[PDB]
Amino acid sequence: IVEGSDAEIGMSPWQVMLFRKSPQELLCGASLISDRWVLTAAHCLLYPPWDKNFTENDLLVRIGKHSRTRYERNIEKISMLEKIYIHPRYNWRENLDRDIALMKLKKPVAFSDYIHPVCLPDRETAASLLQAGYKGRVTGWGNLKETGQPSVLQVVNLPIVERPVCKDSTRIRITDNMFCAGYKPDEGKRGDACEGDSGGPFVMKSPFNNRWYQMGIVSWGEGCDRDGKYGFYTHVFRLKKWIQKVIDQFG
């Protein structure tokens, strides 16, 4: 996260760290959606241009974390993966269209003050909240700058941007499965997700029922926090039919 701030304790209890076993390092962000299911970006697990193709045993899921590097004894919980499910129409060749994946945990995680699932939106949540100017929140332990690494979980609040403005900022083809967020050069304020934040959640707090909903997944960008550029997020609701199908069949 570039130009964000330290998260408060228990601020994003659904935040998950995807952790590579060897070498011991941050793979990506992710989010807790039930006691056995974790949501992330497909490019965190499968990305042929960078020789990324992780299997279940290559990684661990670390839940309830705040500090990036430290082992948070009696706070964090470390889970193993039973199975990975990548969207069958995930487009890694061109624009990361349908950049979404689910991971089933071997055992259910126990909820606590630091571990708690986020809601997934329904059609009405998405229609009411996914509006240009409305702000969401992005969290992660990724890069503090495009070109270092934070001590604790970072947070940034960012406005959803008009689809023509998202389209006009890039040469990349944008699909309905994506949305972009961030401030315009005129707005003054800054902030963006960056390398290492991928897979993390873009959340919004419903003013109707006061619940946090994960509207987006940190997916891609061209650099980090550049003027006239925006962060791109996987549109969670657009892909909920797939989420439900995987959970109904395998959970």
């Binding site: 076993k21 011991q24 390092e25 661990l60 590097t69 430290r70 082992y71 470390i78 193993m80 690494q149």
Partner: peptide, 10 residues
């Protein structure tokens, strides 16, 4: 730079 995690986690 990551602190070792308990052996129980593999």
């Amino acid at each position: 730079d990551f602190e070792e995690i308990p052996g129980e986690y593999l």
